[PDB]
């Protein structure tokens, strides 16, 4: 993916490895080396007016 990776408090179960929004977009991941959870936040976009 592309995004701002951020530290997060979404308490995954031991076997859970990534997480999803209501519209199924991925919005969290475990780092497979240090087993804490990252939030994935989309990189900014918008209209230039």
């Amino acid at each position: 993916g592309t995004g701002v990776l951020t530290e997060s408090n979404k308490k995954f179960l031991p076997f859970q490895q990534f997480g999803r929004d209501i519209a199924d977009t991925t919005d969290a991941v475990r780092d497979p080396q240090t087993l804490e959870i990252l939030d994935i936040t989309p990189c900014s976009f918008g209209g230039v007016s």
Binding site: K10, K11, L13, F15, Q16, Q17, F18, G19, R20, A28
Partner: protein, 445 residues
């Protein structure tokens, strides 16, 4: 012997965290309130996947064996919780139905008031295990209520399980493809589920994606009456079509003056042609060749000739050139088959069978009249601008294959419009009325 499954046998379907959401999925699950087989060992059919559970604390239920034979003939699963660890191996084992005490190897691995429950399935050669443990007091039935089973093992071991057994208080049931609504709580855990087919209220919950639904009337489904039977109504023709006379004839015509035989009022088994190894090509256009024995026609026309193997590329829909526009051209929407074979074993002379010769949709001119190819009136004599129209095939016995003779039959099919007249080897049924039925009238399904 049997027991109620209640709402047991849901497992976490994926490694995906979801918060406080009523997610929905379709998968192999144990259906709610189904009959579960009960035991107090036998060899059991595995079907599409298993739910297994037992009341235990002794570990007399040491594990399981799974495979086709469960012994000798194949790599086969052995699983044993040996109190030191869960031990797994998949060897070509040599053991009977009870290798335990009184009370190749392509993979291996090492890890009542109580009950343990498990789910086993295999997909794409990945054998997969889910589990849970619990205390209980009502061990006299499968425990009412809900908690989620969770994964342990997922391995590409490839063994086709069809049978299994326990190793020496337990129950067995089977997974089925169903749609579920799953209540993930505000902590990433499944805490409740709806089996959508269980009753019209469960269809309604699954339609609204909610465990509670308001007072009202909700559409969940469409009903249609189903066919009770199938009907074949066909012509009662007894005659069989002359394909031996078409294909095995003494000599085919020239491509410039091609023959055509009508086939009518007979049953045609095109598998007699289509199965034959003899044909170098069997190019069928508006119909697939596999289907020909199931269709029906108003007429069939076998156009036929012998022609040089190189020109087969012009014997196709909408083509142009000397073989096509000056000999035999197919229409752009040709419904039919081009059937041919190399005929060098019969049509080839000792140096040149010059009797075979070459120069609109299904057009033919039989005339050998001189091409008056310019201003000079040729009056039947060749010269400059004055040429005999028919070139001759030099069919010797050892020509290169593009220069060899080939025998051709092109079947053109007349579709059903008028009544059935050439038809497949289908057998007519009795006729049923007033019921819903599938039907087939002369190929009109």
């Amino acid at each position: 012997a049997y027991t109620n499954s209640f709402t047991r046998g849901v497992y976490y379907p994926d490694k995906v965290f979801r918060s406080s959401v009523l997610h929905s999925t379709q998968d192999l699950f144990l259906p709610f309130f189904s009959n579960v087989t009960w035991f107090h060992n036998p060899v059991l059919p595995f079907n599409d996947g298993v739910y297994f559970a037992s009341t235990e604390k002794s570990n007399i239920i040491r594990g399981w064996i799974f495979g086709t034979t469960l012994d000798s003939k194949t790599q086969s699963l052995l699983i044993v919780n040996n109190a030191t660890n869960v031990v797994i191996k998949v060897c070509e084992f040599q053991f009977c139905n009870d290798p335990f005490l009184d009370v190749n190897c392509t993979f291996e691995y090492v890890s009542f008031k109580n009950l343990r429950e498990f789910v086993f399935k295999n997909i794409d050669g990945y054998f997969k295990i889910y589990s849970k443990h619990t205390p209980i007091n009502l061990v006299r039935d499968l425990p009412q209520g809900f908690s989620a089973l969770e994964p342990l093992v997922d391995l590409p071991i490839g063994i086709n399980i069809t049978r299994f057994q326990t190793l020496l208080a337990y129950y067995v049931g089977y997974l089925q493809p169903r749609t579920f609504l799953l209540k993930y709580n505000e902590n990433g855990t499944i805490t409740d589920a709806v089996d959508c087919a269980l009753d019209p209220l469960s269809e309604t919950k699954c339609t609204l994606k909610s465990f509670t639904v308001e007072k009202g009337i909700y559409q969940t489904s469409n009903f249609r009456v189903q066919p009770t039977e199938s009907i074949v109504r066909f012509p009662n023709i007894t005659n069989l079509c002359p394909f031996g006379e078409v294909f095995n004839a003494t000599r085919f015509a020239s491509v410039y003056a091609w023959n055509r035989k009508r086939i009518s009022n007979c049953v045609a088994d095109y598998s007699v042609l289509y199965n034959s190894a003899s044909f170098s090509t069997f190019k069928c256009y508006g119909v697939s060749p596999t289907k020909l024995n199931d269709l029906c026609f108003t007429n069939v026309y076998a156009d036929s000739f012998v022609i040089r193997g190189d020109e087969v590329r012009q014997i196709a829909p909408g083509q142009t050139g000397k073989i096509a526009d000056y000999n035999y051209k197919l229409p752009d929407d040709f419904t039919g088959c081009v059937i041919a074979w190399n005929s060098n074993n019969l049509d080839s002379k000792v140096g040149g069978n010059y009797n075979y010769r070459y120069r609109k949709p299904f057009e033919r001119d039989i005339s050998t009249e001189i091409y008056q190819a310019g201003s000079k009136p040729c009056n039947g004599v060749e010269g400059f601008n004055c040429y005999f129209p028919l070139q001759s095939y030099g069919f010797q016995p050892t020509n290169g294959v593009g220069y060899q003779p080939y025998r051709v039959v092109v079947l053109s099919f007349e579709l059903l419009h008028a009544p059935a007249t050439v038809c497949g080897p289908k057998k007519s049924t009795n006729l049923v009325k007033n019921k819903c039925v599938n039907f087939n009238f002369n190929g009109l399904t």
